[PDB]
Design a protein around this ligand. Structure first.
Ligand code: K
Ligand code: K
Ligand code: K
Ligand code: K
Lengths: 95, 95, 95, 95
């Protein structure tokens, strides 16, 4: 279960690095903005303060969403159930 | 399970084609933008760089969301569990 | 299961009517725009082509989201599993 | 189950207070706008009428989303199943 978490963590980082490199390069964003945009996209928040302007970028974004959402939300689920929940329970019992 | 995936894949493509034809025609978008907008809508990202301006478009979008979200997210779930997950597991074991 | 669906359908309509009346009145939107905005909000798409400008509207929106998401997505789930899925299966078998 | 709900309720309030203090301070928002923005972010609506403009804010938002979504949606789930659903069932049976 901690190996579950480690693998999803690594896969999430790799997915976000991919988006960061793509949007910096093709859409001209600063790397920090490309990372922020990738996260805002795959978590489905979608502020729209950044959005792709090129057709290459729009096509990549379609594929990136379909491939990336399942992973990101898998990681969020495991983070909440396997890390946050036990730490919350631990705080309820003094030692 | 591969037939599960094939059917949801075909249904997702048909749903996206419907949106592409509607928004190109009624809202005047380029076909690639109409496809991109349909995906950004049904995955609930919603950047808002495109949004419907006509009342016909707003009404269609209401119905398209309610009909389309369940399918799209069904496909994403099956993609992640039935395709991405086994390929990830396969990479962990050399042959 | 059809009574499950009927009840969630009615509750979803009532929830959307509430939002339509509120945003038309307090935020000055046309009724069709208030309905469209309510749907775009509770399905979490959030284009931002409309958003509340008054403090009353921002406060209402906070509460409306927390109360409304669970219902709307309950209805979407039942629509997809109890209505769309059987109709899709029915199309695969000629009579 | 009512203690389940109480704990998630308190944790949700604390999470929203954190965001309210951060975005008011670093991004200069009025407290009510910072609260509204925090809710619009963690429920994944993401209108984009507010969005972070500083790099500190963008970095915080990335972490806030990953930590906050699992909690918020846990609370929404329990609200809908453990509070809204029984009250709806209660209305169907006069006394
Ligand atoms: K969303
Ligand atoms: K959005
Ligand atoms: K969104
Ligand atoms: K937006």
């Amino acid at each position: 279960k901690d190996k579950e978490f480690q693998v999803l963590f690594v896969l999430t980082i790799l997915t976000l690095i991919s988006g960061t490199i793509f949007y910096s390069t093709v859409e001209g964003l600063r790397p920090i903005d490309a990372l922020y945009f990738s996260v805002v996209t795959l978590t489905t928040v979608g502020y729209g303060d950044f959005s792709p302007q090129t057709d290459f970028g729009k096509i990549f974004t379609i594929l990136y969403i379909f491939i990336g959402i399942g992973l990101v939300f898998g990681f969020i689920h495991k983070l909440a159930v396997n890390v946050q929940l036990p730490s919350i329970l631990s705080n309820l019992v003094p030692r």
